[PDB]
């Protein structure tokens, strides 16, 4: 099985609170390093996702604030396949691409 070894590498993170989320499901074509902007307290990660079923390229940004959120964000590499649920953040009004916060995510590498 090609996907047999991918099961042992699953990493799942979730929140027990339920908000309105944007669901992304696909491969990570390109992911950059992390930037610290709000007084070196947050983490900014630009993501390029090739979705599933349409194979279109979308660009998003991810924000991390806690230690566990940064740990979950650090698991995303190139060619990683993700089922990510992201809460929209109101800072996208000053951004070219939307800024999101990880609510639930499942990561396989």
């Amino acid at each position: 099985n090609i996907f047999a070894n991918k099961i042992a590498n699953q990493k799942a993170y979730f929140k027990r609170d339920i908000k309105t989320v944007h669901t992304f499901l696909g491969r990570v074509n390109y992911i950059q390093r992390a930037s610290k902007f709000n007084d070196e307290k947050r983490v900014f990660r630009p993501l390029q996702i090739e979705l599933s079923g349409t194979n279109e390229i979308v660009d998003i940004y991810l924000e991390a604030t806690t230690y566990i959120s940064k740990k979950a964000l650090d698991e995303i590499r190139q060619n990683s396949y993700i089922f990510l649920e992201a809460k929209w953040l109101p800072e996208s009004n000053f951004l070219n691409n939307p800024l999101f916060e990880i609510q639930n995510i499942v990561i396989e590498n």
Binding site: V28, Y30, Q32, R33, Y67, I68, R77, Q78
Partner: protein, 528 residues
């Protein structure tokens, strides 16, 4: 059924009358929720101290009570993990759900296990603090006191030690004695944020709780720790703090008619704490095979170590970490005084690699302090003056550490060896340099396919000088050199940096491609 009647309610104690075979600390049930413990009793009556309080239950003279005929035993439930409980087991804040099936019931005054059930303390306990892990080691089964003034960072040090067990399979128990509920909720939030909530319990007795609850909270915590130890688990217990426990015991004894002794404390205040702290240690395979590590906290007044309770507690534990107010005012965090701090276990509590790495650093630190306080004239002895003024300042820069920052044991050892080999001479008080080095080493030893095996070798076996030199020269130094030259501009012209890193292999071509692939800033071979 009820067999006792309340006769008097004074001094916050209840005077039950009835004919029964009372025993010390026997649970007496006044309702299905409220119960107390017997302190003193005779052939016709007893004096009881309540542990709970109920709004709908109005205890009064003539009320009925049942003497259950059993000693005070704390029950163990599965949902203790990731929860705040009180001394009777009720879950004040919970993350999971209970099953109403008691895994065990532990007597609170369980006598300490005898000498033949013990073992030597030889396995490190990671506290996440470089100075503590390298100069003041803590072994699994040790009793280390954190003693100091108010607002100096004792609780921060204990929480840091309790955060470093995120991936070590060591249970955490935090007993709060007369603490503020705001701070306890904040600690719960920090536990959840730092991924150790599923591994930790918090026993709480607030400052306005019943005096019996505040007195018996540490014993209940120790009973839970003993339950966990009996199935071969390493338990790390923090008591915050034992001065409040001494005050609670004094209040309970004074209100019960016991005569005051030195400093108004009862006459057996030393026994109360010794029989409590002697329940920790390392036990043999036939008697559980686990360990219990205790980190009691004590508060001094303006540096007065010679206080009654602080000197009682120093003469019980295996060393002390003393937090200085002068260093805290000067801005040093964590403000730990190395001169007044001891660890009687010593290198016996360190791994072979850490013992090799941190050998003879306290002497160099004391020599540096002696020179700094007594420089006197501008006349200089030799280059050894610069040697000391360099290595001591490098060590002092290594001392500083952010709050809630966990620095791994092997990362600390590697930093010590780099310092001792002169690979930190270029430092000129640029915190980002050490931050970069620490992050690179941490990621390399945690995630790299070959770095993970290197870390396992460092943890298990004791390598010699030649193998360590090969390890440093052929993997660690190229990675450090590339990741330093790409972030610090002044390192291009730093004469010491070229003098030390000239012959190191250049690895920019591969680390570039690793960065462009989204890899972390320490992977050098691949992810395991």
């Amino acid at each position: 059924m009820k067999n006792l009647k309340i006769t008097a309610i004074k001094d916050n104690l209840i005077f039950v009358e009835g004919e029964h075979q009372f025993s010390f600390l026997e649970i007496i049930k006044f309702s299905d929720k409220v119960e107390g413990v017997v302190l003193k009793a005779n052939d016709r009556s007893a004096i009881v101290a309540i542990l709970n309080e109920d709004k709908d239950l109005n205890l009064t003279v003539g009320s009925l009570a049942e003497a259950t005929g059993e000693l005070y035993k704390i029950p163990i439930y599965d949902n203790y993990l990731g929860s705040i409980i009180n001394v009777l087991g009720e879950s004040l804040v919970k993350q999971y759900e209970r099953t109403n099936v008691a895994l065990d019931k532990k007597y609170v005054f369980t006598e300490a296990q005898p000498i033949f059930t013990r073992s030597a303390v030889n396995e490190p306990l990671v506290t996440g603090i470089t100075v503590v892990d390298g100069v003041l080691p803590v072994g699994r089964g040790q009793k280390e006191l954190i003693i100091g003034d108010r607002g100096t960072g004792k609780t921060a040090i204990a929480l840091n030690a309790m955060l470093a067990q995120e991936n070590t399979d060591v249970i955490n128990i935090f007993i709060a004695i007369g603490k503020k509920r705001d701070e306890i909720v904040e600690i719960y939030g920090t536990f959840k944020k730092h991924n150790i909530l599923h591994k930790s319990i918090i026993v709480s007795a607030a400052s306005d709780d019943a005096v019996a609850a505040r007195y018996l909270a540490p014993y209940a915590g120790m009973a839970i720790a003993e339950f966990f130890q009996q199935i071969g688990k390493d338990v790390l217990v923090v008591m915050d703090d034992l001065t409040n426990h001494a005050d609670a015991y004094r209040e309970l004894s004074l209100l019960a008619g016991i005569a005051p002794a030195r400093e108004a404390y009862p006459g057996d205040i030393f026994y109360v704490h010794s029989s409590l702290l002697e329940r920790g240690g390392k036990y043999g395979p036939e008697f559980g095979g686990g360990s219990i590590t205790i980190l009691p906290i004590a508060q001094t007044l303006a540096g007065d170590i010679s206080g009654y309770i602080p000197t009682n507690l120093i003469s019980i534990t295996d060393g002390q970490i003393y937090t200085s107010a002068k260093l805290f005012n000067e801005g040093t965090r964590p403000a730990i005084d190395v001169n007044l701090s001891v660890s009687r276990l010593g290198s016996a509590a360190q791994s072979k690699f850490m013992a090799f790495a941190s050998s003879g650093l306290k002497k160099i630190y004391t020599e540096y302090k002696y020179l700094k306080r007594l420089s006197s004239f501008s006349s200089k002895i030799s280059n050894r003056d610069l040697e000391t003024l360099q290595k001591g300042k490098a060590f002092e820069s290594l001392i500083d550490q952010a709050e809630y920052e966990v620095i791994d044991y092997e990362t600390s050892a590697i930093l010590f060896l780099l310092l001792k080999k002169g690979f930190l001479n270029f430092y000129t008080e640029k915190t980002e340099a050490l931050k970069v080095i620490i992050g690179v080493i941490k990621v390399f030893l945690a995630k790299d396919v070959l770095g993970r095996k290197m870390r396992a070798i460092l943890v298990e076996h004791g390598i010699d000088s030649i193998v360590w030199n090969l390890y440093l020269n052929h993997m660690i130094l190229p990675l450090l050199k590339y990741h330093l030259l790409s972030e610090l501009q002044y390192l291009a012209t730093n004469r010491e940096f070229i003098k030390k890193f000239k012959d190191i292999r250049n690895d920019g071509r591969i680390l570039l491609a690793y960065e462009r692939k989204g890899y972390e800033r320490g992977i050098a071979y691949d992810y395991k």
